[PDB]
């Protein structure tokens, strides 16, 4: 689409992997005037907003918060607190015909002011003065929708550039749209720190014979202690037991007599740490 009829593509319930888009390196620019280019793939939003419009290479800087332009101040403005991001790439590959591609449109003559996020379909003729138009294409009345020509072998400032806006708006609804939560390999029979979706802690991940409910995932005990959970990847019961710990008691005689000691790792089989169990 163009700047005059920029549409909105709002999609909910996404896992938005922006890491592959940041690692693509195929677009012209990726620096967005919002949050930092990193850490955005771990923060969770309610839904993503997408737009579509094209601007020439001479006005690719007019899609930044706090900018002026004859093309941007009447077709698509930026919010005062824009926190999302804007991606643009060189569109002079498949959308630029010879003699001037007049498919896309644009509008530069408007008497009223434009507000951020305001898509208008104003097609009526505009008056550049005080005399009324009364339906004429003569003096003091110009048609706002002019021909957005695309010269295929012109300067960079005239080449087409497909621009998309990805606003990261937050509402009162719970956050749903966020990216990848990567996992690791499975560790068995070792005191390791687990990073499950619901629980985070340390323990030994072993197998057991108890079977959970088809909808139940986690599991507690009598005195509110976790005993076993279900692996999110493969449906299986993993017994979570606290790894071996205890207290060291040094049994030593009088230091005036000798200087030898004998440690005692309490309540441990001491296969995990003169041996006499």
């Amino acid at each position, epitope marked *: 689409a163009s700047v005059y009829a920029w549409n909105r593509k709002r999609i909910s319930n996404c896992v938005a992997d922006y890491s592959v888009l940041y690692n693509s390196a195929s677009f012209s620019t990726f620096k967005c005037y919002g949050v930092s280019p990193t850490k955005l793939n771990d923060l969770c939003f309610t839904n993503v907003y997408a737009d579509s419009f094209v601007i020439r290479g001479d006005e690719v800087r007019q899609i930044a918060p706090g900018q002026t332009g004859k093309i941007a101040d009447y077709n698509y403005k930026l919010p005062d607190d824009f926190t999302g991001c804007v991606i643009a790439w060189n569109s002079n*590959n*498949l959308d630029s*015909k*010879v003699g001037g591609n007049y498919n896309y449109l644009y509008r530069l003559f408007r008497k009223s002011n434009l507000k951020p996020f305001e898509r208008d379909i104003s097609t009526e003729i505009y008056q550049a003065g005080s005399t009324p138009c009364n339906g004429v294409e003569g003096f003091n009345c110009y048609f706002p929708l002019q021909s957005y020509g695309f010269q*295929p*072998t012109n300067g960079v400032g005239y080449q087409p550039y497909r621009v998309v806006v990805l606003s990261f708006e937050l509402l009162h609804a719970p956050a749903t749209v966020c990216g990848p939560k990567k996992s690791t390999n499975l560790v068995k029979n070792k005191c390791v720190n687990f990073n499950f979706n619901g629980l985070t802690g340390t323990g030994v991940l072993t197998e057991s014979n108890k079977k959970f409910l088809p909808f139940q995932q986690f599991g507690r005990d009598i005195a509110d202690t976790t005993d076993a959970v279900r692996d999110p990847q493969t449906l299986e019961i993993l017994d979570i037991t606290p790894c071996s710990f205890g207290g060291v008691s040094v049994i030593t005689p009088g230091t005036n007599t000798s200087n030898q000691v004998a440690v005692l790792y309490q309540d441990v089989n001491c296969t995990e740490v003169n041996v006499f169990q």
Partner: antibody
Amino acid sequence: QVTLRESGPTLVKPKQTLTLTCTFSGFSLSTPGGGVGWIRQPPGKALEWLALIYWDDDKRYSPSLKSSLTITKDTSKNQVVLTMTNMDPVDTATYYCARLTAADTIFDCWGQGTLVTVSS
Amino acid sequence: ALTQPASVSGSPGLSITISCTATSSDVGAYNYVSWYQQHPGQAPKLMIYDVSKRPSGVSNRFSGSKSANTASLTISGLQAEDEADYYCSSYTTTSVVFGGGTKLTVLG
């Protein structure tokens, strides 16, 4: 994917209507950038572009024979007809059906070459 | 007007330069240049599609780039082979011109 088939009558009369049907398959005139066109080239001479049918039904013509150059398309039959009206005696050349796949790739696909002579 | 010399032939295995003219304001920026290679009796083959990058169909030692305002396809490795007619092509402000042609032969 490259099934360019150049057809049309070779021996035509002076000041007649030339018909060049270029049948193809695979790529069609739906994706932007893809554009079929004809290139005029006399035997042993250089090349020159005459018509270029684009995906948006744009009939781009050349100023050399702007008054007499006309070309249509058919997305269903996958056949593009070049209607060169008022065939002059000097218009004897070898037409070549090509396909502008993109703006940078200038006429990737090329046909075989059909010689068209004009006389009485 | 992509005017090209008639026939600039040279010794086999030499990087002979093929040139066509400046292609002034009638041609906007000279950013879409595609050299051709038309064998006698067959269809022309595309040796390059962009200023520097060549297509994937006839990927060979056919290299070339535009320095200031003219393009030159320099062939050094795969030169001792068949010969044909070269054609530099580009778009103008409103039309598409092919210019003349360079019937480069293999002298010797």
